[PDB]
Amino acid sequence: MKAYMFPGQGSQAKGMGRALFDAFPALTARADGVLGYSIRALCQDDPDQRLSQTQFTQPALYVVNALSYLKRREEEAPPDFLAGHSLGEFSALFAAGVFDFETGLALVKKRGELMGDARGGGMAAVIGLDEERVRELLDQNGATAVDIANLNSPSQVVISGAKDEIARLQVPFEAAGAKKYTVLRVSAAFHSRFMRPAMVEFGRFLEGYDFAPPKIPVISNVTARPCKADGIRAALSEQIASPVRWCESIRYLMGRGVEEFVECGHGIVLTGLYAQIRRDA
Ligand SMILES: [Ca+2]
User: Fold this and answer.
1) Feature table: binding site for Ca(2+)
2) How far, in Å, from the CA of 211 to the mean position of ligand 1?
3) What is the CATH code of the structural domain delimited by 119-186?
4) Catalytic site residue 160?
5) Residue 93 alpha carbon to ligand 1 centre in Å
């Protein structure tokens, strides 16, 4: 059995998707229709570093992920399971037939606007400590406005919360054995109950759409279990205010009997996470 993994923010790069745009002109033009700019120019030329601005990053990654998937479906057998990292979930649900290409793109455009417009708090990526050790350190250092935002591998965790606490935790984390601690360039403390207003707004936005049942199961970042057909809105809206349970999602699939994990989209970010999850499991 085989799973496709769709990457999210952080995996974008100038020049990405070039060959896919060439091969899928209809979807390239349809994407332009939703966005109002050339999607190819955004990805290839990266005008004014817009690719690092989340309201453009998210559409770019969605389109490249979606076209990467369709290329794979022409050339090899369908996957048995799908999973996407944050933005990646939207491309996973597109692949599963939950919504059409345009709808998915409209949803990520809105997601990018909400997250770009978000204010308050920050985030840091931590390499070299497990979840338990991270939780212990937050406690020990009195960081009661900081929580775990991403569980990406057994040694890769993202934390999220009050800006001053995110700053102050760096040295103690490094002294505890973190191989790297990097304060991220983001608008706000994503993936905490802090983002509840954005969650509510996105949920209400999603009421205006009509979804179809997934034809291939999609593992939710919120639950680390397959999305229910009647729970698409909760899975997508609550995701932005909930911890991203990526490591658990991959372990769930391994426990189900999935042996092959393939990254579907630009880069090798999820491939590297998979190597670490598999090495530990
Ligand atoms: Ca509806």
Assistant:
1) 207, 209-210
2) 8
3) 3.30.70.250
4) no
5) 17
Q: Is 127 helix (H, G, I), strand (E, B) or coil?
A: strand
> Is 266 marked active-site?
no
Query: How big is the chain, counted in residues?
Result: 281
> Please, which experimental method was used?
X-ray
User: And the tokens for 165?
Assistant: 């606490």
CATH number given to 1-118+187-281 = 3.40.366.10
CA neighbor of 59 nearest in space, from 83, 33, 98, 22: 33
> Which among 11, 68, 86, 187 is annotated as catalytic?
86
Task: Please tell me if the domain spanning 1-118+187-281 has the same topology as the one spanning 119-186.
Answer: no
Distance 156 CA to ligand 1 centre (A): 38
The candidate with the shortest Cα–Cα distance to 147, out of 199, 190, 84, 182, is: 190
From the candidates 153, 187, 191, 237, give the one annotated as an active-site residue: 191
Domain ranges of the chain: 1-118+187-281, 119-186
How much distance in Å is there from the Cα of 209 to the middle of ligand 1? 4
Resolution of the structure, angstroms = 2.0
For CA atoms 69, 277, 223, 142, the dihedral sign is negative
* Residue burial 93-123, b: 16+ Cβ < 10 Å; e: rest: bbbbebbebebbbbbbbbbbbbbbebeebbb
